Enzyme design. Structure first.
Site, PDB file in Angstrom:
ATOM      1  N   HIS A  80       1.148   2.935   7.977  1.00 35.83           N
ATOM      2  CA  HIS A  80      -0.124   2.653   8.592  1.00 35.83           C
ATOM      3  C   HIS A  80      -0.094   1.199   9.043  1.00 35.83           C
ATOM      4  CE1 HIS A  80      -4.402   2.816   9.108  1.00 35.83           C
ATOM      5  NE2 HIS A  80      -4.731   2.264   7.953  1.00 35.83           N
ATOM      6  N   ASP A 166      -3.290   5.261   2.495  1.00 38.21           N
ATOM      7  CA  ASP A 166      -4.711   5.256   2.153  1.00 38.21           C
ATOM      8  C   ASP A 166      -5.225   6.498   1.454  1.00 38.21           C
ATOM      9  OD1 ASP A 166      -5.279   2.643   3.026  1.00 38.21           O
ATOM     10  OD2 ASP A 166      -5.669   3.296   5.087  1.00 38.21           O
ATOM     11  N   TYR A 194     -14.493   5.959  -2.345  1.00 38.60           N
ATOM     12  CA  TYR A 194     -13.497   5.762  -1.321  1.00 38.60           C
ATOM     13  C   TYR A 194     -13.521   6.885  -0.282  1.00 38.60           C
ATOM     14  CZ  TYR A 194      -8.904   4.573   0.580  1.00 38.60           C
ATOM     15  OH  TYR A 194      -7.785   4.159   1.276  1.00 38.60           O
TER      16      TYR A 194
END
Ligand SMILES: Cc1cc2nc3c(=O)[nH]c(=O)nc-3n(C[C@H](O)[C@H](O)[C@H](O)COP(=O)(O)O)c2cc1C
Ligand SMILES: Cc1cc2nc3c(=O)[nH]c(=O)nc-3n(C[C@H](O)[C@H](O)[C@H](O)COP(=O)(O)O)c2cc1C
Ligand SMILES: [Zn+2]
Ligand SMILES: [Zn+2]
Ligand SMILES: [Zn+2]
Ligand SMILES: [Zn+2]
EC number: 1.-.-.-
Lengths: 398, 398
Positions: A80, A166, A194
């Site tokens: 990422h 993530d 989250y």
């Protein structure tokens, strides 16, 4: 300061950020900081998975040097390219100009955009491609929009180690690294805060990706995300959790968020609540000017009902209520019923705006023209709200 | 605790609220508290102008009793029915059930709505009606929407004393009562914070009202508002100030409000600022997640340009930027030029929302399709922003 072994030849070499209180600028509140996880896989060829937030590059490098000093690095995986994971890219590249970058196409474009002026060897990867490091190898799984268009997970067959970046992470700072050294309920709550604020809009993509991984019948023995704790003792729990959250079935719970200037909208919020509770429903009530938006959104992930209220000031809604609404439209809560309510003194105006924004978030109003009251509520006004709460309860049934 | 004489027979009998930090619920921030001003005019018949916020009724009564104990009260003027002024109505009415209420029609309706269960003798007043108290008398001036539909001012000819209720007030707590016992610049700033967040939407009504008072040629020697300091030494300043603010001519100033997650929108805000400063313009730059919305609005009162920026998250604007936008639409800033700007990673989406809301506040965009940047700004991108700031400066001219 010291790297931590996940197993021989595989180390955590990230950085812990104790004092950060807000992530993505203002977007996400981290009451307990967070961490930037990066992994070093040592072999005939050694690979580093992801880097670290630029202000912590020293810690990354210092930890790398603790495994082997002249940092080797044959491959640098970039799952990422947001800044919390690719910020120390220039520094690492400067430390090993020969490192071979393994990343997605969109990743590669992003990388040239955020840095240019830095030339490097590379190979665009696709779901299924695999590089060998010797005894171990790393295969890749593209994960478009599993946060970012450039997203992808890395998988280490030989160890059944998944490195989703993530996905599956939680924003929490600890000196301890594994799920078995942390309270089960606390860490699952962080994980939900989250998911609710970052992954909620891509719930359908989450199930699809979960299924793909399910079909291919991937053996997952440990999950190491880019933020937080490493799920080494029970990855199943967090995977089942993601599945439930992404499905969106919900729970017989209702979240009421609102605000008031003189208490009438509050009195209505209260009645609505009484009806919801009488109808056998759990209720979380939030006065927005005194509550954390991210803590409210987290509660909405499991709720089946979302009621939002506000009086009208200058023919608009109260400005404290705005953040929550624009945040709902963007996060696209899946399968939720709702209601808007509030008082007014003469013309009104906030009710239209509330219903407009609630519909834009694809939340089905349980009632076109929600409860509205002029100046102060009277007995029947509160009774009507109570009945309404009872109605919502019946639908959120379970 | 002690009442304060404005002049013989006329007393301030309000309450000082030192610890309040937010008024109208979340809407207005009072860094230094506020006060609830009420006045007792003693004569053959004694009249009380306005009451006080419910929680301070004991201070009101305590003060009334120090003037004359059996509280007499023949007339109770209710200029405004919001709760900070009419909250102690039940208690006053229960202390003198025979008190004659003097108020507007809309006031009378509000009063029956917020209280009912309380009957009282009264007489609807209109601009021009006047009641005598003996040596002095009180005449009234209707002031619809000079904050509320029921608003009105009270005038005492014998003393050229104007009691405008909210108009001309400032939210500030002090043990001192008059404008000549306070710093001129600090009190005028509080006065502007007040005007900008409350009266800005009715600037056209303000000039009309100021004119009517101008023509009738009313002698104003002292202004006693419902909040703050009493203008007893120089009512002119505050009246001229309201005139200029209502007019909306402005000053060669530009306010730039924004937020970012990774700094690109900030770098643009910076560039735009340099161009504006280069073009001879004063600039106030506000990172919204760290600034006070009311403090920002106050700066816009005088500004001729309002630039708002934001990156795009989940196809929407950043939630912290929402409050200021919905508050600008409702406040309806008069005669302002503007521009929206911000970065994005792929599809974008915040620019649309920004421009829409900016138009909704009737702010003329100095450029449909405002500066937008993908990922990070490059040299020409910042140059362009600089030029745009330069352009806006040219128009804001002066
Ligand atoms: C600064 C201020 C602005 C207001 N603007 C409006 C308005 O534009 N339209 C309206 O119908 N009521 C308006 N009101 C009245 C409120 O909507 C009304 O008092 C309501 O009862 C307050 O609701 P709450 O007690 O839940 O805070 C306004 C009140 C205040 C203090
Ligand atoms: C959680 C998160 C969500 C995002 N959503 C979008 C989106 O829907 N559309 C888009 O074009 N970019 C999106 N982006 C990319 C940002 O708009 C882009 O990175 C931008 O450069 C950040 O602006 P800034 O540097 O001024 O903070 C998103 C970024 C993050 C971190
Ligand atoms: Zn250290
Ligand atoms: Zn109850
Ligand atoms: Zn006292
Ligand atoms: Zn500069």
């Amino acid at each position: 300061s010291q790297p931590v072994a996940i197993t021989d030849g595989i180390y955590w070499v990230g950085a812990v950020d104790w004092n950060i209180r807000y992530f993505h600028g203002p977007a996400f509140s981290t009451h307990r900081g967070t961490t930037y996880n990066a992994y070093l896989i040592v072999d005939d060829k050694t690979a580093l998975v992801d880097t670290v937030y630029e202000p912590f590059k020293e810690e990354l490098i210092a930890k790398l040097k603790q495994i082997k000093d002249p940092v080797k690095l044959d491959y640098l995986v970039v799952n990422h390219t947001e800044s919390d994971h690719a910020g120390a890219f220039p520094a690492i590249m400067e430390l090993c100009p020969d490192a071979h970058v393994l990343c997605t196409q969109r990743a590669f474009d992003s990388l040239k955009a955020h840095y240019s002026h830095i030339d490097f060897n590379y190979t665009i990867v696709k779901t299924g491609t695999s590089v060998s490091l010797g005894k171990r190898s790393l295969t890749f799984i593209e994960a478009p929009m599993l946060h970012w268009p450039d997203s992808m997970f890395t998988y280490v067959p030989e160890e059944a180690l998944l490195l989703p970046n993530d996905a599956f992470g939680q924003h929490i700072a600890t000196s301890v690294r594994f799920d078995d050294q942390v309270d089960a309920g606390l860490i699952m709550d962080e994980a939900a805060k989250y998911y609710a604020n970052i992954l909620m809009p891509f719930s359908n993509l989450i199930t699809k990706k979960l299924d793909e991984i399910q079909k291919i019948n991937l053996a997952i023995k440990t999950i190491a995300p880019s933020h937080g704790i490493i799920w080494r003792k029970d990855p199943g729990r967090i995977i089942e959790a993601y599945a439930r959250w992404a499905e969106g079935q919900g729970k017989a719970k209702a979240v009421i968020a609102y605000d008031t200037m003189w208490l009438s909208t509050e009195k209505m919020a209260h009645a609505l609540m009484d009806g919801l509770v009488a109808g056998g429903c759990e209720v979380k009530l939030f006065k927005l000017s005194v509550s954390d938006r991210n803590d409210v959104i987290k509660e909405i992930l499991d709720a089946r009902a979302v009621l939002v209220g506000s009086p009208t000031i200058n023919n608009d809604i109260l400005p404290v209520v705005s953040p929550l609404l624009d945040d709902l439209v963007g996060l696209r809560p899946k399968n939720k019923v709702g209601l808007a309510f509030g008082a007014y003194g003469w013309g009104g105006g906030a009710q239209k705006i509330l219903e407009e924004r609630l519909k834009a978030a694809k939340i089905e109003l349980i009632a076109e023209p929600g409860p509205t009251v002029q100046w102060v509520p009277r007995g029947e006004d509160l009774q009507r709200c109570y009945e309404l709460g009872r109605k919502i309860a019946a639908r959120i049934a379970d």
